[PDB]
Amino acid sequence: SEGTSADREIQRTLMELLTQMDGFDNLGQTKIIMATNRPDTLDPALLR
Amino acid sequence: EKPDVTYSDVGGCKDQIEKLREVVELPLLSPERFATLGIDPPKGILLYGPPGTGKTLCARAVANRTDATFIRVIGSELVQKYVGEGARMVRELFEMARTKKACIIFFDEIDAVGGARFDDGAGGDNEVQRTMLELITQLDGFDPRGNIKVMFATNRPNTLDPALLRPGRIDRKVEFSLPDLEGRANIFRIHSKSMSVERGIRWELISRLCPNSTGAELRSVCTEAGMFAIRARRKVATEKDFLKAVDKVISGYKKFSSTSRYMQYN
Amino acid sequence: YDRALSIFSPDGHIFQVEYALEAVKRGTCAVGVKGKNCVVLGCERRSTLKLQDTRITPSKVSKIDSHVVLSFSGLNADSRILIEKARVEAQSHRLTLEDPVTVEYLTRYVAGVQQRYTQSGGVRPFGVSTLIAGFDPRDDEPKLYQTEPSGIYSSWSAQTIGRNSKTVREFLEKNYDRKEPPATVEECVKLTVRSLLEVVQTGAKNIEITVVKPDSDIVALSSEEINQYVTQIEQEK
Amino acid sequence: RCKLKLLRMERIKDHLLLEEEFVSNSEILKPFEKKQEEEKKQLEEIRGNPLSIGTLEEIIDDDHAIVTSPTMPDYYVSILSFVDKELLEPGCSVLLHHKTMSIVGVLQDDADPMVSVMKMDKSPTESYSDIGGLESQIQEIKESVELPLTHPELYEEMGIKPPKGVILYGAPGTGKTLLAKAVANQTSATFLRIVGSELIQKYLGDGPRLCRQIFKVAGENAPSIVFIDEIDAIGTKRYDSNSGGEREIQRTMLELLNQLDGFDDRGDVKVIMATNKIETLDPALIRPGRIDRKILFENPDLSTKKKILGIHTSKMNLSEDVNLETLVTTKDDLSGADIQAMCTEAGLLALRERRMQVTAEDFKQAKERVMKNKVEENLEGLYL
Amino acid sequence: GTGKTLLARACAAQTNATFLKLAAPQLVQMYIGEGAKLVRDAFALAKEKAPTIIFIDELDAIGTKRFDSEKSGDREVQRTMLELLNQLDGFSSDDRVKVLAATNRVDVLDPALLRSGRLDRKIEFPLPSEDSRAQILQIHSRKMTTDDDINWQELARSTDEFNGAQLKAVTVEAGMIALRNGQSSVKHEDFVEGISEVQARKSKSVSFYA
Amino acid sequence: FLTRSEYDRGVSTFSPEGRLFQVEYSLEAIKLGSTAIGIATKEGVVLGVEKRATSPLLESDSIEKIVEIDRHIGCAMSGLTADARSMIEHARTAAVTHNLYYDEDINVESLTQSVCDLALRFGEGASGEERLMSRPFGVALLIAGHDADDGYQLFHAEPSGTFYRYNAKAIGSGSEGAQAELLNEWHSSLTLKEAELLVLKILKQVMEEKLDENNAQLSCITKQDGFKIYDNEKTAELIKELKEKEAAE
Amino acid sequence: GSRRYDSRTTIFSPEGRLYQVEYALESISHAGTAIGIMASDGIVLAAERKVTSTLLEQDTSTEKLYKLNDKIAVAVAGLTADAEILINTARIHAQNYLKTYNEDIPVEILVRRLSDIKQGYTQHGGLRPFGVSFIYAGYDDRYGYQLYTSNPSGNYTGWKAISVGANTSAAQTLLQMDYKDDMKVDDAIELALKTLSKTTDSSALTYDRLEFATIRKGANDGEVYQKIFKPQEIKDILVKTGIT
Numbered sequence A: 001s002e003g004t005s006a007d008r009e010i011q012r013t014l015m016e017l018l019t020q021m022d023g024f025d026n027l028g029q030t031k032i033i034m035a036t037n038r039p040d041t042l043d044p045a046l047l048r
Numbered sequence B: 001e002k003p004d005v006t007y008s009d010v011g012g013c014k015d016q017i018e019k020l021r022e023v024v025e026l027p028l029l030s031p032e033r034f035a036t037l038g039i040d041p042p043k044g045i046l047l048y049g050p051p052g053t054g055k056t057l058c059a060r061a062v063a064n065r066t067d068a069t070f071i072r073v074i075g076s077e078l079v080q081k082y083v084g085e086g087a088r089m090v091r092e093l094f095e096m097a098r099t100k101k102a103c104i105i106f107f108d109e110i111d112a113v114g115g116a117r118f119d120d121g122a123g124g125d126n127e128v129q130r131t132m133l134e135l136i137t138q139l140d141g142f143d144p145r146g147n148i149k150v151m152f153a154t155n156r157p158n159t160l161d162p163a164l165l166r167p168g169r170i171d172r173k174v175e176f177s178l179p180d181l182e183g184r185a186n187i188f189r190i191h192s193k194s195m196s197v198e199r200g201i202r203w204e205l206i207s208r209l210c211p212n213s214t215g216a217e218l219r220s221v222c223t224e225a226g227m228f229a230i231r232a233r234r235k236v237a238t239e240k241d242f243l244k245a246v247d248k249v250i251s252g253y254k255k256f257s258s259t260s261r262y263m264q265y266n
Numbered sequence C: 001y002d003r004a005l006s007i008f009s010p011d012g013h014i015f016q017v018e019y020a021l022e023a024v025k026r027g028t029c030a031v032g033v034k035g036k037n038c039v040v041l042g043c044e045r046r047s048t049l050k051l052q053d054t055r056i057t058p059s060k061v062s063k064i065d066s067h068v069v070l071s072f073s074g075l076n077a078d079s080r081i082l083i084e085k086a087r088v089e090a091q092s093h094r095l096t097l098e099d100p101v102t103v104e105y106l107t108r109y110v111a112g113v114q115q116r117y118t119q120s121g122g123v124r125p126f127g128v129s130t131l132i133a134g135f136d137p138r139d140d141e142p143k144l145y146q147t148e149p150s151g152i153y154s155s156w157s158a159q160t161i162g163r164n165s166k167t168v169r170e171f172l173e174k175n176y177d178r179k180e181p182p183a184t185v186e187e188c189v190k191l192t193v194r195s196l197l198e199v200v201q202t203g204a205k206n207i208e209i210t211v212v213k214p215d216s217d218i219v220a221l222s223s224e225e226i227n228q229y230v231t232q233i234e235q236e237k
Numbered sequence D: 001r002c003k004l005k006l007l008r009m010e011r012i013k014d015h016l017l018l019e020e021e022f023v024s025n026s027e028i029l030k031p032f033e034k035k036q037e038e039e040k041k042q043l044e045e046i047r048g049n050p051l052s053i054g055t056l057e058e059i060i061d062d063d064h065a066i067v068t069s070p071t072m073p074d075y076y077v078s079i080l081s082f083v084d085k086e087l088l089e090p091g092c093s094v095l096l097h098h099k100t101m102s103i104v105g106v107l108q109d110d111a112d113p114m115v116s117v118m119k120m121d122k123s124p125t126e127s128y129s130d131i132g133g134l135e136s137q138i139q140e141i142k143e144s145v146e147l148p149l150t151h152p153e154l155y156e157e158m159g160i161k162p163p164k165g166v167i168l169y170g171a172p173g174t175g176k177t178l179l180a181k182a183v184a185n186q187t188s189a190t191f192l193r194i195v196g197s198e199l200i201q202k203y204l205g206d207g208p209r210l211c212r213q214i215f216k217v218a219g220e221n222a223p224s225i226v227f228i229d230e231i232d233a234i235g236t237k238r239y240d241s242n243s244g245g246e247r248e249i250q251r252t253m254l255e256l257l258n259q260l261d262g263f264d265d266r267g268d269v270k271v272i273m274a275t276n277k278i279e280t281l282d283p284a285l286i287r288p289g290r291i292d293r294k295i296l297f298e299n300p301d302l303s304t305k306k307k308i309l310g311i312h313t314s315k316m317n318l319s320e321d322v323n324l325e326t327l328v329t330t331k332d333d334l335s336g337a338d339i340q341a342m343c344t345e346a347g348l349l350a351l352r353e354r355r356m357q358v359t360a361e362d363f364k365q366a367k368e369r370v371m372k373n374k375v376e377e378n379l380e381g382l383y384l
Numbered sequence E: 001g002t003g004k005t006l007l008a009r010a011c012a013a014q015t016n017a018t019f020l021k022l023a024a025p026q027l028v029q030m031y032i033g034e035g036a037k038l039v040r041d042a043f044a045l046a047k048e049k050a051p052t053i054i055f056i057d058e059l060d061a062i063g064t065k066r067f068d069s070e071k072s073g074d075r076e077v078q079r080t081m082l083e084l085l086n087q088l089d090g091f092s093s094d095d096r097v098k099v100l101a102a103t104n105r106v107d108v109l110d111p112a113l114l115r116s117g118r119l120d121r122k123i124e125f126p127l128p129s130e131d132s133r134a135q136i137l138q139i140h141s142r143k144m145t146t147d148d149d150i151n152w153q154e155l156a157r158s159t160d161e162f163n164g165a166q167l168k169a170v171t172v173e174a175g176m177i178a179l180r181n182g183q184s185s186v187k188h189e190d191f192v193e194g195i196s197e198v199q200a201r202k203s204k205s206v207s208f209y210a
Numbered sequence F: 001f002l003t004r005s006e007y008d009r010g011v012s013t014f015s016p017e018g019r020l021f022q023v024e025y026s027l028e029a030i031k032l033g034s035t036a037i038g039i040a041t042k043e044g045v046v047l048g049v050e051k052r053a054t055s056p057l058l059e060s061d062s063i064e065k066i067v068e069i070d071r072h073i074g075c076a077m078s079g080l081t082a083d084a085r086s087m088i089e090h091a092r093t094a095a096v097t098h099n100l101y102y103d104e105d106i107n108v109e110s111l112t113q114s115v116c117d118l119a120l121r122f123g124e125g126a127s128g129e130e131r132l133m134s135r136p137f138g139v140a141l142l143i144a145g146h147d148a149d150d151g152y153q154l155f156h157a158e159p160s161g162t163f164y165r166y167n168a169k170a171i172g173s174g175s176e177g178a179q180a181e182l183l184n185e186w187h188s189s190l191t192l193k194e195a196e197l198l199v200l201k202i203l204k205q206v207m208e209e210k211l212d213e214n215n216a217q218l219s220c221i222t223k224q225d226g227f228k229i230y231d232n233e234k235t236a237e238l239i240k241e242l243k244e245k246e247a248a249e
Numbered sequence G: 001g002s003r004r005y006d007s008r009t010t011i012f013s014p015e016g017r018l019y020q021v022e023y024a025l026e027s028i029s030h031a032g033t034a035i036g037i038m039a040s041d042g043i044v045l046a047a048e049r050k051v052t053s054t055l056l057e058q059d060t061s062t063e064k065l066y067k068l069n070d071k072i073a074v075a076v077a078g079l080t081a082d083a084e085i086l087i088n089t090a091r092i093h094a095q096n097y098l099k100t101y102n103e104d105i106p107v108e109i110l111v112r113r114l115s116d117i118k119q120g121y122t123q124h125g126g127l128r129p130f131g132v133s134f135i136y137a138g139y140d141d142r143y144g145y146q147l148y149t150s151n152p153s154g155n156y157t158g159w160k161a162i163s164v165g166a167n168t169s170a171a172q173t174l175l176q177m178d179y180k181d182d183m184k185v186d187d188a189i190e191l192a193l194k195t196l197s198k199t200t201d202s203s204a205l206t207y208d209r210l211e212f213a214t215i216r217k218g219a220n221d222g223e224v225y226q227k228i229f230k231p232q233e234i235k236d237i238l239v240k241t242g243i244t
């Protein structure tokens, strides 16, 4: 978000995932399988 | 709308403008000769060469003559805040010109937006090179240009696309040159015939005095000589004031670096 | 080390020769004017700073032989390497060829010295410009030369180098004559003092004058002397 | 009596004028009573209320147009009633009828917060000879800026095109800033002034729309003189490097070449550029005929600085004590902004005292503070 | 210069298969969720009108090698690259939907287009050959009128390493020369002088010791 | 200044040009050269140089760009003249070396070839010869001469390391204007005082003052009189007799 | 390779000027002050230490003051490592002069030699300067007492009163007002002390933070007694002048 507006669109949607994954919202019997083609693109809060 | 500049007024009196008159001007007047030949008529042309050679001045001259639509583009006008916006712009502009019948698209100053394609792997040049690509894909198309005559004006051939400078879609490409020792004499006669001067002068003399130079200097040899005219409080221009002015322009050129310099990188 | 400190420029120069000329511009101003039977080098000294020992400190005019003076503008520190080469060549000429040096031969040597540090690798030019003046031996023609950090040498009728040299050079077109020098030694000294008082200003204590007459007589006029010469110019003006 | 004489005529005339217009408000409507009075009734009923703002995208030549309203819905409106179609053409803000939308007329137009930076609200109160001295390199800025507006006659005798452009260049503080604002007081035609630091932005694409605009407004409200103050600022100022950088600098330059000149055939936009990084510009910028006579300024000479210092000490309290000429002696090829700062600093010594007088002592002290600035970011002392 | 785009149009029309015309820069949009939606609707359409060949002209506009982006609007561009790689996976109803792709360079493609399953067969268009050049010249020159003293081998020896766009540009350039002499038939001595006048390069530059 | 140069980090590095950039720059320092004109005939060679006045306080009769290599070979320097201070010594050494080893007047071509072998020795250490330079020389010569084996010859020596034998060549700033006139007015049927007067014709056009012997100098190399520098009194006569015949028009 | 990573720090700036010299001059006002004041009967050299700690031993320290020979001592201000080197170069030069002429060096000659050494490092070889400033107090018969400062460029000027190191501008102003052409050594000692009391970069000014040394004509028979004082003789003359 020194780029375009696209990159804070990314940011809004990413913050939503973290409260889900670990929060006062707790999981469950729900599982994440995450398939990526290169993992060092990622934000390290998605390496967590 | 077509600005009024005579065809005899030109930025350079050469055979180079005659070559233009065979690619652009003549199949609009007569596609009869190019039917008799049967050849496909050439459409594109590159206009290139040093500044002050009246790059855009002969294309205002040719806009007086042909009376076709002129649709002028600035290459720095093709870049917007967000990417793919400018993708919209170019595509749409070309399709409006297809609907239009007997039109010319004059690509001015497409040194940014028209440049070479290359990879940076982290740049911000990629976002610009989307619109660079949008210019290619429209020119070949999947349909031909149905009477769209295409000029590209580049200061620089030093960097250009090699598929915006492939030789089948920019056809004959004309190097515009510096006036000769005869060519400055021609230019400067178009320019001093327009000025009141005291008869018995040499237009040959003033060219010799000058080194190999532009006519945009010869348009300013007159006008600065005209200011030395008003300070002496003369209605007329004489030899003496023309000498001061030749010295004035040349000294300045060296001091900076007006010629044999083109700057940029893309 | 054998890597270049001189990188050729597309302009038709070398950057470091252009940088070396500026460095000379920022230096203290020297005038040279030659009479019919003298030379006169006047130089500005900044004595503006107070509690300066001036007795023990060398003038900005250095004798390099018994009849060849060298004055300089630009980097003061750098200059001393040139003065040590030049004193060394002066003896070498006596050793191997006999007689004292000629002003021309010595000027050429200096020219090749500053030149060398342009063209060689591992070294940057010297930003120091010299006024070399003097007599040839057996002779009584004043010969006044200027060498410059481009390693280009020149003869001159009169010259000035240093800070705001242009202001003095225009004065020298108009008050010194190509055809006639002023013929007394005294008038020549006062013509050069009168010139110095354009840029130097601020009293007569920042003016220093070395006068050389043939037959190997280098004497430098003290402050007191200058004081009298300046006051004359002052009153007449 | 010398102020009063001016006042006595001019005030009484502004008081009468004001009074005149009060009695006169009523009187406007009296030469008609059905000749125009009636016309007014007819237009109004057509218009009704509210007149809904639209934005006109494009016209069609069959008496219709396509508006896009800022409230969303497009409408295929008709150009009918009390409207010329020559006062219509892209970019207009229009009055629509609140039942069936017809364009009843165009009255609305809305100014940008960027045409607000460009357009000036002043006419310069200072005029020429507030840095005066070097007053022969000023008739290269009044024989090519002032004068072809003032006289067409002179350049008609010689015929041909009359002057176009100047680039002012030199040391900083040598008057460049005040030169531009001193010719704008004399000519009295639309004076635009834009800083070059605002031409450099941290966002792309908007860079070119700004530079393309300045000359478009300029040609519209012609004659205009556009002062581009600082075009040395295009290569030294730059924010980030990923929406800044080379790309953004190159594009704004490219844009500026079309404007001046280019193919536009815009209005009169004499140009005044101040610079000192003239070799960070294009060869198609410092091209002749977009620069005509170019002006070099160097530092004033000793007798010039006496012109400069007597302008500045007229506004100040004086004594027989004050001596200008020894202040001149000390400074040696320095800017007249240096000399302008000693006089401004000399009243700072008066202010510090709280004494209303200015003395020779006040000018010499602030000369020492001015020379402290110059040689103390230096630390060589004597040239090493 | 090798007539990448020309070949694909001609051959897909000859043999008949539903020819979808898509230029890759059109997928770039400053909208997402509408620009990205041309991709979505481009499979949905294509599975109805199946078997069909999806011709993307250029594939550098959405075929960015980048997927490590730092501080740019290149994460907007790549969402039409990613959405492409999803529907070029089977969740069936794509076994009969194909891809032709033309591109000017192939060193700019993503590592997820090196792989088979995307474009499996990888065809290079080479610079012309001796036999090939001679042919090319005859196909343009069929359109215009020539004289009967032409030898297509002569012209093809004398052009070496000329691409098909330059060779189109000799054939045209010959009837310019014809027009200027003022004929109505195009000689075999004109095509030779169009070699010099229009190429690709203006001479061998200035040589001062080369 | 600041004109695109992709490569130029090495002092020999390539370059999509196919030739080094640094050598090219060296030739662009000879267009700032004070103009040197030279007309070679079969009866003699005339080297004319504009001494170049810079000031009225500069003594312009003391400074000159005629430089003697030896009695049978003369040479003229234009460009950056500090670079020619080093080479001209070398060339004079060279000639002398030949007279020591062989007791013979050296070929003009051979001598020209020797300062070219010198001209190419820029580098950080490479080839057979140890580099001692690091930046290329920015100076061009016109070595004239007379040998009794191939006659009058005149060579244009480059900072490149290349030599082209000319029949007349002008170099310097006004080079472009000079070579238009040489092309039409030169021929091989000239005589010595018609050439001499041709040097002053072309000198007249590239003159930035006016023509007089206080800023122009002529010099010759003649078979039976050798290399002779023409003094100013003699120079004057010819300049006036041009001015007599140009007033017969 | 190597040429790529080459610093090139010995090239001129656009100003004609040498960035690394200035950077050296910048960093010596980060080292302590050393002052010289020339009396007519002797020379006082007064240095303020750039270190002090109660756990420091600053009593065998002669960390600013060095004897080059028994007639010319120096005050050092700057990077001490570079300085140590020149100090034994100087000793080697003094003894050389003494070997060949069998006569002690004049102050004029040794100051010119050190200066030429410095000049070489800024002139070429791609090195960085030796960032040191020396105040030379010396006696010779030919020109008497002579006082000198040299800087990292390698240029020298004689002075009647000088200050180097920290607050150069400041110390200079003071010196000019409280100097008189001819003084006794005591009056000088006093003045030396007084300037350092107004310029001290900590409020307090003490004996253990003074290195202090003279050269006195209080040696009979026209000889000069070089004295580097013990810090307990400094303590008394500091109570004398009433600072402490």
Ligand SMILES: Nc1ncnc2c1ncn2[C@@H]1O[C@H](COP(=O)(O)OP(=O)(O)OP(=O)(O)O)[C@@H](O)[C@H]1O
Pocket: B009, B010, B011, B012, B013, B050, B051, B052, B053, B054, B055, B056, B057, B058, B179, B187, B190, B214, B215, B216, B219, D262, D284
């Ligand atoms: N060769 C010439 N003969 C006559 N007039 C000339 C010539 N060259 C330049 N001019 C003058 O220069 C003026 C402006 O040139 P113009 O803008 O048309 O040129 P260009 O070569 O496209 O350069 P640029 O596009 O970089 O401005 C012309 O109106 C004309 O007065």
Ligand SMILES: Nc1ncnc2c1ncn2[C@@H]1O[C@H](COP(=O)(O)OP(=O)(O)OP(=O)(O)O)[C@@H](O)[C@H]1O
Pocket: D129, D130, D131, D132, D133, D171, D172, D173, D174, D175, D176, D177, D178, D179, D274, D308, D311, D312, D336, D337, D340
């Ligand atoms: N000749 C002078 N007479 C009066 N004031 C002067 C003169 N020269 C300059 N000044 C004053 O100095 C100040 C700065 O000058 P100005 O902006 O006009 O020019 P400049 O050379 O562009 O310098 P800078 O841009 O750094 O301020 C202004 O208040 C100006 O009036």
Ligand SMILES: Nc1ncnc2c1ncn2[C@@H]1O[C@H](COP(=O)(O)OP(=O)(O)OP(=O)(O)O)[C@@H](O)[C@H]1O
Pocket: B140, B163, B166, B168, E001, E002, E003, E004, E005, E006, E007, E102, E135, E136, E139, E140, E164, E165, E168
């Ligand atoms: N085999 C051929 N036969 C005849 N003419 C040919 C042939 N191939 C190409 N050409 C000519 O060359 C032109 C260029 O071809 P095309 O545009 O298809 O190529 P490309 O390599 O994809 O180039 P670009 O996409 O950069 O325009 C054709 O329109 C035609 O005139």
